[PDB]
Each structure stands twice: as C-alpha cells, then as structure tokens.
C-alpha cells in the first residue's frame, strides 16, 4: 500500500500511500518521475516528491496485472555517472536504523 522515498543520509522517509499492491517501479530517464505499475492493471506516474500526476488503465483492470515496466535508457543522461575514478569507500562501526 505504501512506497517510502528517501534521498541519501537524510533522517526520514516519505512512506506515501497507494490505491493498490505496488508491483513494479521505474524512474524516468532524467530522474524526475517514478512510474508505478499496479496489480489492478493501472500504471501511474508520481513526481520525485511523491505527488501523483498521471494514470493509465489497461482495458480490463485487475484481469491484467502489471508485472514489470521500464523507461527506455535512450537519452543524454546515460553518460551521467559514466565518469568516476574514486579509489576509496565509506566505512562504519555497526548497522544503524532510519526512522519513520
């Protein structure tokens, strides 16, 4: 029922609500919308803050569960993060919890 967005090492998570079982999820190629597919045969489109902007229903509804979806990689952003040569990593004593 619920999908839990958060950005790196902030102290909280947006446990935001859904109409239906949320089977599969995929970010837009520019990062600005998270699109969700539902067991109810609907795909819906949510912005990076979690507001819902667009819906499509497959004619038949829950007859046709959406078991996976994928945004096409074909835009300028695919080389973004394709230039790294960092030689070291983060390290921590013991595993923490993130609240709410």
């Amino acid at each position: 029922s619920d999908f839990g967005l958060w950005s790196p090492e902030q102290k909280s998570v947006s446990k935001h609500k859904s109409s239906s079982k949320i089977i599969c999820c995929s970010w837009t190629n520019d990062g600005q919308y998270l699109a969700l597919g539902m067991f109810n045969g609907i795909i819906s489109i949510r912005n990076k803050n979690g507001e819902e902007k667009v819906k499509i229903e497959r004619p038949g509804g829950s007859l046709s569960p959406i078991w996976s979806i994928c945004w096409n990689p074909s835009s300028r952003w695919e080389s973004f993060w394709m230039n790294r040569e960092n030689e070291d990593a983060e390290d921590v004593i013991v595993n923490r919890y993130i609240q709410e």
Partner: protein, 119 residues
Amino acid sequence: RCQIMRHENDQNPVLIDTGMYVVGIQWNHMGSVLAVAGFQKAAMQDKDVNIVQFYTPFGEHLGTLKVPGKEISALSWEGGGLKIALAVDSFIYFANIRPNYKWGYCSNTVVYAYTRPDR
C-alpha cells in the same frame, strides 16, 4: 585552483594549481587553448604583477604573458583566435598570438590539419 571536466558530472576531471590570484578564464574559438587571466605576487616585492597563463585542455602549461597596469579586469579571444584582448586599468591591450598549427611542407605540398564541426 582550476578544474577541467569532460561533462557536467565528470568526477575524475583534470586538476591544476596555477599559483596565482585568478580573475577570469576563456577558451579560444577552436577549444584547443584555455587562457587564465590573473595576477601573482612579484618575486622580490610586496606588489602584484598581472599575468595571463595559457593551458592545454589536458592541463599542460603552454606559456605566461605579463601585462603592465594596476589590475587585469577581464579576458577575451578574437573570433579567429589570432588576438586576445586584455582589459587592464582603463586600457585594452591586444596580445598577438601565433598558433602552433599541426602543419608541415614536403616537396611543394603544404600539409595543414584542422578539427571539424561534423567529424
């Protein structure tokens, strides 16, 4: 400090310490030279001298040009890349500049080479 990237989130860019107080930077029209305008503390004085330092895109130092006046304010290349205008203390100087072209002459053929907009 200066930093030259391949794209807006290149996390392994070219790193440069110019060793001077920088006021501004400009590529030449062909993108083959970066000019850096600034001033450096003079070697025997509590006084600053105006300099332009020229760099390759890969951060190798091509040369240094001094200019007379209180401060260099700003920097800009001619559209042909054969002059650079230096705004300094109510004057504009113009440095002539003689490119190190990829060229040579052999048996009454001239060989000249250039980068292209479309290759």
